[PDB]
Amino acid sequence: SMVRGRISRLSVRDVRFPTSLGGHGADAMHTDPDYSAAYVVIETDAEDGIKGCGITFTLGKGTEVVVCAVNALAHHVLNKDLKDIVGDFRGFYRQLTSDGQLRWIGPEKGVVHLATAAVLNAVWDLWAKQEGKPVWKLLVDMDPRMLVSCIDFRYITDVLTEEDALEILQKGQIGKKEREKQMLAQGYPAYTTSCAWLGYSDDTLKQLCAQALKDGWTRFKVKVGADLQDDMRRCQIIRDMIGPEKTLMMDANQRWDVPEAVEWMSKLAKFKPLWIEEPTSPDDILGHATISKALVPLGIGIATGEQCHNRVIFKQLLQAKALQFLQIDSCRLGSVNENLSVLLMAKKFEIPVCPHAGGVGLCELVQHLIIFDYISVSASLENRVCEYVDHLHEHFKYPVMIQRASYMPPKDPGYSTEMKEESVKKHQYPDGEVWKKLLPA
């Protein structure tokens, strides 16, 4: 190991992009988001210029609450040797997520968990950079006992023990060189959400579809759930542009009650969607299973997970057979540590993982987790695909590289969390240039 240094400084800033003024990103539930992030930077006393950068994604308002919670957690990482953190990553994870007082404001959900993901993302970035490897490669090269030492198994040993996790990782060693070669040569298959958004005229939507088809996209998501006639109008346009052999996914962003989701989907089934994403509340495990049993006979699978708050919810979704596609999120769960536990549970249950992405930097982070999944955990692309959105990559130092609608594996050390300091400063809320122009004093 090349790990060194004591964590000496932490900064956290409220960064907001005015995407609600751009006209893209509206869904049936979040009709006016301003893609934002709590951006964390940690420094060591190593004098090597290597910094750990971390993010968590928000929709604008509430980013200041996340920043507050990052400040509440900061004393746990400050003045700690990085060797001591990475040497007992499970222990450090438990101190952040089960703090005897702070856990009351979660536990492991909402603001406090988003803040925990931002801090832990900065530590994974720092560790991967000191090791001179992208996070996906750090994970791929990790000894299975070392990897399981980073994971907290509390509340999931009833479906996945440490021993079960080791067995999946040992099996994942077989053909790992061939799978890493495959990833470097062709990338991780993606779908586009760039034609999905609510509010587009017919002409606008036809233009976005034509451009995506021309650019090589063959898998498409569409937002639904506010207005059935509008959903039929937009699904008709997309399905006519893309043809019957191309993949169409629908996303209701939690709009419906359980019987309502079945009824609405019975009317949209003519568009032959591969899946219906978030048909109801992200907490309703039994609800997702009820909708899944009703719709799998129509040939429609259920997808959920982007707002699923922790591994206990994912465990029950797998236990209840509530979903056909499990959608991890790099910044909703407890960073790499908790995402690893969910990848391992999904393989244990033989359920495909289709990551959520988009927002501010979710593509940049989550691509590492799913490349690692392919090489070392599931060893398959069957029924698996990574979301992609064409937003805000110009603000990242290491933006995602898409080739033939595929994620090319990041080459640089780190978790691709690092933002351009000029971008951070212009978009800092409330005093950055952009917000002084949009909300003048």
- Interacting residue ranges for its own copies, rule: CB under 8 A: 29-34, 58-62, 64-66, 68-69, 72, 98-107, 109-114, 154-155, 157-158, 254, 257-259, 280-287, 290, 307, 309-310, 312-313, 315-316, 319-320
Least distance (Å) between residue 198 CB and its own copies: 12
Least distance (Å) between residue 20 CB and its own copies: 9
Tokens of 341: 């536990």
* 251 labelled ligand-binding: yes
146 touches, from Mg ion, its own copies, none (C-beta below 5 to 8 Å by class): none
378 touches, from its own copies, Mg ion, none (C-beta below 5 to 8 Å by class): Mg ion
Which of 328, 309, 310, 338 has its CA nearest to residue 384?
A: 328
Least distance (Å) between residue 17 CB and its own copies: 13
- Catalytic-labelled residue, pool 129, 223, 347, 391: 223
- Catalytic-labelled residue, pool 24, 133, 356, 368: 356
With a CB cutoff of 8 Å and minimum separation 6, the contacts of 326 are 303, 304, 305, 314, 317, 318, 342, 346, 351, 352, 353, 354
Least distance (Å) between residue 222 CB and Mg ion: 11
CA distances from 290 to 95, 284, 295, 345, 412 (A): 37, 10, 9, 21, 44
Of the two residues 115 and 308, which places its CB atom closer to Mg ion in the complex?
Answer: 308
30 touches, from its own copies, Mg ion, none (C-beta below 5 to 8 Å by class): its own copies
* 177 labelled ligand-binding: no
Exposure string of 143-182, with b = 16+ CB inside 10 Å and e = fewer, is ebeebbbbbbbeebeebbeeebbeebbeebeeeeeebbee
Exposure string of 79-111, with b = 16+ CB inside 10 Å and e = fewer, is ebebeebbeebbebbebbbebeebeeebbbbeb
164 binds Mg ion (CB under 5 A): no
Stretch that binds Mg ion, among 64-72, 143-151, 245-253, 401-409 (CB under 5 A): 245-253
Of the two residues 11 and 173, which places its CB atom closer to its own copies in the complex?
Answer: 11
Least distance (Å) between residue 277 CB and Mg ion: 5
Q: Is 356 a catalytic residue?
A: yes
Of the two residues 25 and 189, which places its CB atom closer to its own copies in the complex?
Answer: 25
Identify the residue among 39, 374, 407, 415 touching Mg ion (CB under 5 A): 374
- Show contacts with Mg ion in window 272-301 (CB under 5 A): 277
Identify the residue among 121, 335, 378, 428 touching Mg ion (CB under 5 A): 378
Of the two residues 200 and 314, which places its CB atom closer to its own copies in the complex?
Answer: 314
* 356 labelled ligand-binding: yes
281 in the Ramachandran plot: left (φ > 0), alpha (ψ -120 to 50) or beta?
A: beta
Residue 83: CA atoms inside 13 Å, Cβ hemisphere, count? 9
Least distance (Å) between residue 252 CB and Mg ion: 9
Q: Is 30 a catalytic residue?
A: no
254 binds Mg ion (CB under 5 A): no
Phi and psi at 119, nearest 5°, equal -65, -55
Number of residues in the chain: 441
3-state SS assignment for residue 57? strand
171 touches, from Mg ion, its own copies, none (C-beta below 5 to 8 Å by class): none
Please count the other Cβ atoms lying within 10 Å of the Cβ belonging to residue 230. Answer: 15
Sort 297 into a burial class: Cβ within 10 Å, 0-12 / 13-18 / 19+.
Answer: exposed
DSSP string over 312-371: HHHHHHHHTT--SEE---TTTSSHHHHHHHHHHHHHHTT--B-----TTTHHHHHHHHHH
* 22 labelled ligand-binding: no
* 27 labelled ligand-binding: yes
Whether residue 373 contacts residue 386, with contact meaning beta carbons closer than 8 Å, is answered with no
* 62 labelled ligand-binding: no
Sort 431 into a burial class: Cβ within 10 Å, 0-12 / 13-18 / 19+.
Answer: exposed
* 284 labelled ligand-binding: no
Least distance (Å) between residue 117 CB and its own copies: 12
* 221 labelled ligand-binding: yes
Catalytic residues: 223, 356
- The binding site for Mg ion (CB under 5 A) comprises 251, 277, 306, 373-374, 378, 384
Residues of each annotated binding site for Mg(2+): 251, 277, 306
Residues of each annotated binding site for substrate: 25-27, 35, 221, 253, 277, 306, 356-358, 387
